[PDB]
Point group: D3
Chain length 206, copies 6
Amino acid sequence: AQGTLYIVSAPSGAGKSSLIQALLKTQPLYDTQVSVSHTTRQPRPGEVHGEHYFFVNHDEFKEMISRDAFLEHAEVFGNYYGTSREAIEQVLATGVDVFLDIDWQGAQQIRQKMPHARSIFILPPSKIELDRRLRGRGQDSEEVIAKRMAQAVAEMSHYAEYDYLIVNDDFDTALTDLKTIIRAERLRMSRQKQRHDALISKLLAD
Amino acid sequence: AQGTLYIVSAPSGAGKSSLIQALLKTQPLYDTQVSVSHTTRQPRPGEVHGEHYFFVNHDEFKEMISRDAFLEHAEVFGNYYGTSREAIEQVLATGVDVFLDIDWQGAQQIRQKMPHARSIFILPPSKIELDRRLRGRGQDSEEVIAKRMAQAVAEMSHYAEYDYLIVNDDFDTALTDLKTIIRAERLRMSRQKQRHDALISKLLAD
Amino acid sequence: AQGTLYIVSAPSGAGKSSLIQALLKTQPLYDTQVSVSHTTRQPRPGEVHGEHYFFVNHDEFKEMISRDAFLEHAEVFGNYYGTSREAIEQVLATGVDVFLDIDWQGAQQIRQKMPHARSIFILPPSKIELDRRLRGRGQDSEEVIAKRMAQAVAEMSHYAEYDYLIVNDDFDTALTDLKTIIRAERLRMSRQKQRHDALISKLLAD
Amino acid sequence: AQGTLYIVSAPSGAGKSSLIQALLKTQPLYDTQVSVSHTTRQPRPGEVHGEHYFFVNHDEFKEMISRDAFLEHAEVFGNYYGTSREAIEQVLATGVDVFLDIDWQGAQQIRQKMPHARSIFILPPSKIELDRRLRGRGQDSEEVIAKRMAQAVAEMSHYAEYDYLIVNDDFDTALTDLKTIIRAERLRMSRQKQRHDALISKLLAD
Amino acid sequence: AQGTLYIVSAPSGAGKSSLIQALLKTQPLYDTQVSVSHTTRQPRPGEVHGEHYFFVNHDEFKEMISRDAFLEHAEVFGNYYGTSREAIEQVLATGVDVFLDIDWQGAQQIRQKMPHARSIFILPPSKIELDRRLRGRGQDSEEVIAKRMAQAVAEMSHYAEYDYLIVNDDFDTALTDLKTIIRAERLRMSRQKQRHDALISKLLAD
Amino acid sequence: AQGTLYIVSAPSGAGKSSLIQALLKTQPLYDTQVSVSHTTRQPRPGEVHGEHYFFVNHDEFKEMISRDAFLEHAEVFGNYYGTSREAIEQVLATGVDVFLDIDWQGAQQIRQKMPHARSIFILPPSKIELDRRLRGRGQDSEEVIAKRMAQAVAEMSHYAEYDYLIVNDDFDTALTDLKTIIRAERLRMSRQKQRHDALISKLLAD
Ligand SMILES: Nc1nc2c(ncn2[C@@H]2O[C@H](COP(=O)(O)O)[C@@H](O)[C@H]2O)c(=O)[nH]1
Ligand SMILES: Nc1nc2c(ncn2[C@@H]2O[C@H](COP(=O)(O)O)[C@@H](O)[C@H]2O)c(=O)[nH]1
Ligand SMILES: Nc1nc2c(ncn2[C@@H]2O[C@H](COP(=O)(O)O)[C@@H](O)[C@H]2O)c(=O)[nH]1
Ligand SMILES: Nc1nc2c(ncn2[C@@H]2O[C@H](COP(=O)(O)O)[C@@H](O)[C@H]2O)c(=O)[nH]1
Ligand SMILES: Nc1nc2c(ncn2[C@@H]2O[C@H](COP(=O)(O)O)[C@@H](O)[C@H]2O)c(=O)[nH]1
Ligand SMILES: Nc1nc2c(ncn2[C@@H]2O[C@H](COP(=O)(O)O)[C@@H](O)[C@H]2O)c(=O)[nH]1
């Protein structure tokens, strides 16, 4: 019937976006999808329009805030980002789970708006590695990294507001962790009661 | 700090006890254990005292009901079975998760008594196979099987009271399912907040 | 020496094409490949020429039927589709297994033509979910879905003609199932007798 | 309805019995079991009566050959071994797959008697390791090992009579191989047509 | 030809013995085995002679120190423990890897004596859980636990002397870690050069 | 701090490049990356500039040899290939492991230059399959294949210079093998001592 919203947040460099992406590779569109956000920030190298993000002017965005197009929006690390209402509501009507790769501010917003949403915070094994991971993928640059690490602390302090916590120490353990959370929620009685309406009905008979 | 109670019920022959047993083989005593019940029913062949059950006279049991020794007890399939208070409370104090292999009546009891308990009902792919599985393990005999199948229907109708549902169609898929439920609960914020008190504290600092 | 043909069919929306695709991601070109079909039907959004299909006019196709270019061809869901002879025969000469994503009509054709071919039918857990999966991937549209579901029944009734059956209840269980069928066929004596000609010869000696 | 017989043979020391044993650890009695043979040979250390074998006098056995108690029997490595009819036929009636840990002579016997049986030969990566494995498990002794290696060659030459071949190079790859063969046979149309009679019937309806 | 010694040490309660035991369950005797130590300490409940340990008087042991029977021996947590020479040397001659569940003192001893030995230290995620694990398995008692935790610090400070480190945060991640170390060492050129002498020779020919 | 260089070589057609590629799919850029080489050889079909290779004229390359741009370079199978210094040194500074898909000549070069580098040779199960794999992926053509097989022997004779050996008999076993080698090296004390500096410090305290 209705699918489930999965908020996922982390200090930049924890590897959250790379986890969510590896997960969807093993997950068909009919079960799981991700929301593509709008944002003012400049496209990094080898980042196409309409896949990772929808890239729009600070002008275009201030007007989306106005036309009320966003389920949530916020300022993080000096730029505007947002999750458009139209897309999300459609996909969720079709029983498909949708992932939101958003910050703590966005998460707080979605939690009032959509109270059945589930949220996962991902932590690094140390701030020393948070910095190392950032430099290690050639996406981002010197100025931008120091900016993000200043807030890395403040980001991580919101961890307790989330339903689930993953320490991404080692990428493959972490991906299993995330796969599991999804798998286990799909074994909850509400959801399994629909998907096996078929079976149950015949079981209870002769 | 405190561990979690996992009620697991199923129509006889669904393979619930064999799943719980395979799970504990891959799970150390310090993380996971199972409660050993008392019961009037006669020991099957190759079933030792003090491992699968505590075998006691209908006399001995009527007195345990009296001395109030049980967290829960009930009549199922013509015999008395029970979960002793003393054992459970001890093990749970030590942060260890404990499994209860009990019927629907027992589950309803534990749910009022211990409201944070989680419960899993396991269903077979059909009643035709429920019977086949019963005959297929040489435990049980002709009389006893027909008795149990009469109630198999009534057992399965309580499935909706549980938090999680597993269709044990194929044993190894089912065991993963159960392993997962446990794994995912241990990723919930409450529990992960203790076990990583260490880490969190240092993360939020310099 | 010679590779094996794997026919795979299913009511539209069962997730057969998405399974076959996930399988090939973990399977090198020298062991496993898929046939690319020709078809009159219009390309869906984000579907390139020469990868998913070869898109040709109803004109171009009627002439391929004439020049006898197809190992098999048929009318399904209002359009023409076909598997070209030239491509298949080449790849199979090189010991590589080839997958055919074709309907029941096509399967019956290949079975007379190529009797050692193995066939797998994939079923959904219910027709209620068959429809849900179709709407859930944004490929296809309103008109087209109702058309396909009318025949979903008739499609599924041919299941018994196939060598293997998979109930795609949960995508990842299903992908293991399919991976397994391939793996197990490669453990058959005929095939293993070539690939270990080396070893066997020395074993039987001193 | 009816289960399947799995003959498994190998030159002594290939690790066939240890594979079959590890497999059953992950396989419930209602799906999979193993036949316990009778034999004249002396019990090794830490080998109990009635689990690995039924240990009987050369006298007791010559009489079983007479009373026709065996589905198959033979002389291998200087002793008599046998698979009793009574046990096998029972277990197979209940839909449970049964494994036969028997030699080539026994396999040839069962193949005429029970033509739907499936057979797996397991080979070592070299005869140099066959000897090493034999000495490496403290079961067996000096005299006995040299005796068995003389026939190791002759044993391995019957490999081509079997349906499936496994090269047990590395134990865990080999165990997956064997698990797979079983899994894939249970996905064959005959067997899956019973176990999902339920589902199929409803699929083909409205 | 010759097998490899695997020293494994940890502060009591880290779960090292339970890991080593789960590992051997998936590992045949011809590839992997564990040394059974002698010790003065009293047998815990449900601990048999000759499996976990060889239980001997302080008298019997002082004489083994004298007759020089031990490859290594030491005083840990108020008792004497030791690894007997005779057993180890035998098993290693047969190409089988042997595990030593010993303390830091023992490890230092074996490292001079047997320089190709590999060593793994296992750490807990915190000392708070080290204590929790100890109480959580009903083996050990109040007095004994506080004694061990006093030295838990001193034990863990020797971690840097070992070749490999595992943080046993979550039992199943840890068991994979250990399985891996073994697997990877068996892929080293020295060892793989013997086990595939066969193959290599033929590869390099025509 | 500093990452590790992984040389990987094999006779053409062994499947080494396809393994390395499947590995990186499950490995984030912050942990693992691959070096992109320069080469004179002509781009095969469906091979883009700047991903598989940097395609340059025999002219452009002779000048790179001159300007000393390469960590290593060599002539293999009638063409020039090379690993540029600039790229490698950067990525390794950031703690990321880098893979080098290079021949034996290149490997010998890197081993003097960078002595902590680890090297893996991959062998096919036979030369008969080496040829089959080459023809089986439509990359390469008739002339080119016979040329490479002549040297396949000479390539494989350098196997003993490497630290680790993989027999790529079956692709998925082989990929696990390679994943493992990486995983196990990251469990070595040197590397784990940095990545858990955090944890260790607190463990050794109260
Ligand atoms: N609130 C909000 N945050 C997002 C959105 N999309 C990405 N961000 C957040 O912005 C931060 C930086 O994103 P990045 O610059 O790496 O793309 C991350 O913490 C990410 O979760 C969005 O649509 N809304
Ligand atoms: N209420 C309750 N049910 C149990 C207990 N132990 C086993 N039973 C239940 O009794 C039924 C039959 O158990 P069995 O005869 O197979 O051992 C099962 O459904 C099982 O869950 C118990 O201690 N209390
Ligand atoms: N006979 C035949 N059927 C195919 C071929 N290619 C795809 N189809 C079948 O046509 C149906 C719909 O395909 P679709 O429109 O989703 O691409 C599916 O059942 C699919 O198996 C083909 O080349 N020949
Ligand atoms: N024919 C036959 N062979 C068996 C039987 N049980 C074990 N053997 C075979 O005898 C050989 C040696 O058995 P072992 O001495 O190791 O127990 C093995 O190849 C094994 O397959 C049996 O019941 N019948
Ligand atoms: N040196 C040495 N230590 C061992 C031996 N066997 C067990 N111990 C060590 O003694 C400590 C406590 O063992 P436990 O009392 O738990 O059996 C552990 O750290 C364990 O590694 C041994 O044979 N020699
Ligand atoms: N020395 C060296 N060999 C490489 C380099 N890149 C690829 N080659 C090697 O050249 C051989 C053929 O490469 P291919 O033609 O298949 O791309 C392979 O053995 C491969 O390892 C390189 O940069 N340096």
